[PDB]
From a paper:
The TonB-dependent transporter [name] is integrated in the outer membrane of Gram-negative bacteria and has been reported to scavenge these fungally produced coprogens. [name] belongs to the TonB-dependent transporter (TBDT) family and has been shown to be both necessary and sufficient for the utilization of fungally produced coprogens by [name] and other Gram-negative bacteria. Using this tool, it is shown that while [name] is highly active in the import of coprogens, it has some level of promiscuity, acting as a low-affinity transporter for related siderophores. To determine the molecular basis for the transport of both high-affinity and low-affinity substrates by [name], we solved the crystal structure of [name] in complex with Fe-coprogen. The structure of [name] consists of a canonical TBDT fold consisting of a 22-stranded transmembrane β-barrel, the lumen of which is occluded by a globular plug domain [Fig. 3(a)].
Notably, all three hydroxamate groups of coprogen are coordinated by [name] through two arginine residues (Arg117 and Arg142) and a tryptophan residue (Trp275). An additional hydrogen bond is observed between one of the keto O atoms of the coprogen diketopiperazine ring and an asparagine residue (Asn373), with the remainder of the binding pocket being composed of hydrophobic interactions [Fig. 3(b), Supplementary Fig. S5(b) and Supplementary Movie S1]. The planar nature of the [name] binding pocket does not allow the coordination of the Fe-ferrichrome complex without significant clashes. The direct coordination via Arg142 of the hydroxamate groups appears to act as a selectivity filter, only allowing Fe-hydroxamate complexes in a planar configuration to be accommodated in the substrate-binding pocket [Figs. 3(b), 3(c) and 3(d)]. To determine the structural and biochemical basis for its selectivity and transport activity, we solved the crystal structure of [name] in complex with coprogen. These data show that [name] employs a selectivity filter in its substrate-binding site, making it specific for planar hydroxamate siderophores.
Author numbering: 58 to 729
The structure:
Amino acid sequence: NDYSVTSTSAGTKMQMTQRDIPQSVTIVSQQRMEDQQLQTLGEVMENTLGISKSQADSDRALYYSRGFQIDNYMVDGIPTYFESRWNLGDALSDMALFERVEVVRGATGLMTGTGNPSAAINMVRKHATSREFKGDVSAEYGSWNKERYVADLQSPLTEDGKIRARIVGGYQNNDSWLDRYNSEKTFFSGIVDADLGDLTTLSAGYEYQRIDVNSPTWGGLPRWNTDGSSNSYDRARSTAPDWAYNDKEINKVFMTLKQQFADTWQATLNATHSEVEFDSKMMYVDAYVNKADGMLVGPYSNYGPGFDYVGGTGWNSGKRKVDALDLFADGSYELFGRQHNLMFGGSYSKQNNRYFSSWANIFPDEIGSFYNFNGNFPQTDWSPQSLAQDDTTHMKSLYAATRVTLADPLHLILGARYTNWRVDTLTYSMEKNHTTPYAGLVFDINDNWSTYASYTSIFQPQNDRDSSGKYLAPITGNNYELGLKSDWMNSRLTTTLAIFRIEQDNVAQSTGTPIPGSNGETAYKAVDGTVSKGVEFELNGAITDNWQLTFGATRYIAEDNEGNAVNPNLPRTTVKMFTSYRLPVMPELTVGGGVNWQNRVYTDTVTPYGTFRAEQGSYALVDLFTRYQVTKNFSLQGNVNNLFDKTYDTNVEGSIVYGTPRNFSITGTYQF
Ligand SMILES: CCCCCCCCO[C@@H]1O[C@H](CO)[C@@H](O)[C@H](O)[C@H]1O
Ligand SMILES: CCCCCCCCO[C@@H]1O[C@H](CO)[C@@H](O)[C@H](O)[C@H]1O
Ligand SMILES: CCCCCCCCO[C@@H]1O[C@H](CO)[C@@H](O)[C@H](O)[C@H]1O
Ligand SMILES: CCCCCCCCO[C@@H]1O[C@H](CO)[C@@H](O)[C@H](O)[C@H]1O
Ligand SMILES: CCCCCCCCO[C@@H]1O[C@H](CO)[C@@H](O)[C@H](O)[C@H]1O
């Protein structure tokens, strides 16, 4: 029921309160997710301070933090990596399966081997913890024929309550503001928690998710006319044909073993085998519009006659396999007459991604005037799919970190992760070894206020070679941070103020000279990359016993080596707040809502006719909720999203993608 979650293992791999973490940490609680109906990982991230989204199409969105892209999401500290163009729906993961989401902003190289200096996102699974049959079931009806049904049930399976089990299952069907769009999803997670004898705990489970989308969009609506004037469409407008579909199926097995070897020492072994399979047939439009006739003009027609295509069709299928295990120990040691905490462990991960494609380009004659276009396009007589990609990544790490007690109110965190990383591709192989250091310092001024200072890093390997022919050294994302954290009411209310600087280094830059003794391979030089700098402030917790409020604000600057704004489509200033208020005179009633505000964003498009700049001015989005506790078991929740019905663009960096219009939702819940 509390917005503030007391402790976390996030950032350092050591169990502590947020105050003791010398990094910017945000934790999204179960209650916040229930109040605002954050049902997907994507919805959690877009309502999280310092995280922004870019929606390429109806089901594909990418998430950014501090000017950089998040390239992996994790489940119980196990990460799964992805490429921008191969979106396996990881942000569509159903939240009903997870207790909470831990967000760490900056360089998270101690938690994971590779990545960008953006953010680590960790989804924590629901566990069977009650010693009594407990659960809840719910039915939700909303706008665009949405129906959502969820059951969460748990119980011990033995008289002593040593063996316990929890099952979460659900189904959702809905349409959209988009013409012909339909999504159907099934989700299910099962877990068995058994306390083996004394000092041993074992967890084992299975996760299944399936999302089938009909008429999903690919790309956006033509933003530009040949004369430079911009275009506007009804938010219901879709380029998705009736034969278009995207279907994905997720199957995972996972086990966690915890052993208490001695007083103050515990060993943990987390393992997972994950698989996702997808099949899709879709069509996209990517062109300018000739205002007089409505005819489309290709953005690459300058290259010649075979390059004037205005869209495409594609039949894409594939499979991702993840076999990963994390083994670590945490305990105490005494040096210089004082107790200090020590964490050490290892990681192994094997990730394979195999894709099949069949595709064709679309020319202006094939589609006709865009003014009469509504997905009414003939399906391609698909040729046989061919192996488009087959990649295997082996990531192996050894990591150690100690929290040193310099004095009672002063702690120094010193860590390092060494990583052996390898990729095997159809065209090449690359192996890289890197040591990522962690240095932090936390000073407790008094019982409620603390200051911190930290140096954190992460590395990103790159498929670029120098004049010698050797692969270029990986990109390092270095985060320098100073801040102030407060804790009140035994961590029930917390505040954080962070000032950061990110230096992305060893970024490949073309020399404009080919590699001697190669077939035109371009030679690259390692140079300083993106520099990002900003401030974050968040207040999270209970103001009073019946008033829970989360309030955040950020402002940052991100620029490349040249000095140009990196991703100008993402807001530099944002304010995200959400609140819950239970009436002291009527405690059966809880009211609330929230406001997400962002400043102006833009994107320049260099075309043949000149430079066209996309604009999206300042806007807020308002959500409201109310919950009435009818009986000790039954409650009714009503939610309104985008109350002022703001028309806004979620894809300023490309073709027009509209954001969610005003939507309503009624939910009945039976708890016990
Ligand atoms: C959609 C789910 C509706 C659940 C309605 C549950 C009604 C519970 O009903 C109770 O169940 C108990 C045993 O479980 C019995 O011991 C009680 O006598 C009975 O009143
Ligand atoms: C052992 C602990 C060492 C921690 C080193 C952290 C140094 C902080 O680094 C500083 O952070 C500022 C951002 O607030 C930047 O403006 C400064 O340029 C940067 O030097
Ligand atoms: C007590 C203050 C300690 C450092 C926190 C303030 C850091 C704010 O950031 C500062 O912004 C300035 C320009 O606005 C730059 O000149 C500084 O390099 C940069 O550190
Ligand atoms: C001392 C505690 C912080 C004081 C309030 C925050 C003011 C931070 O100052 C801001 O920091 C940014 C990041 O370095 C700079 O880019 C901005 O120019 C500067 O205004
Ligand atoms: C798939 C739908 C599952 C419905 C499960 C209903 C479980 C009811 O469970 C019962 O609920 C009663 C209160 O309603 C309590 O008296 C009992 O503790 C509990 O056993």
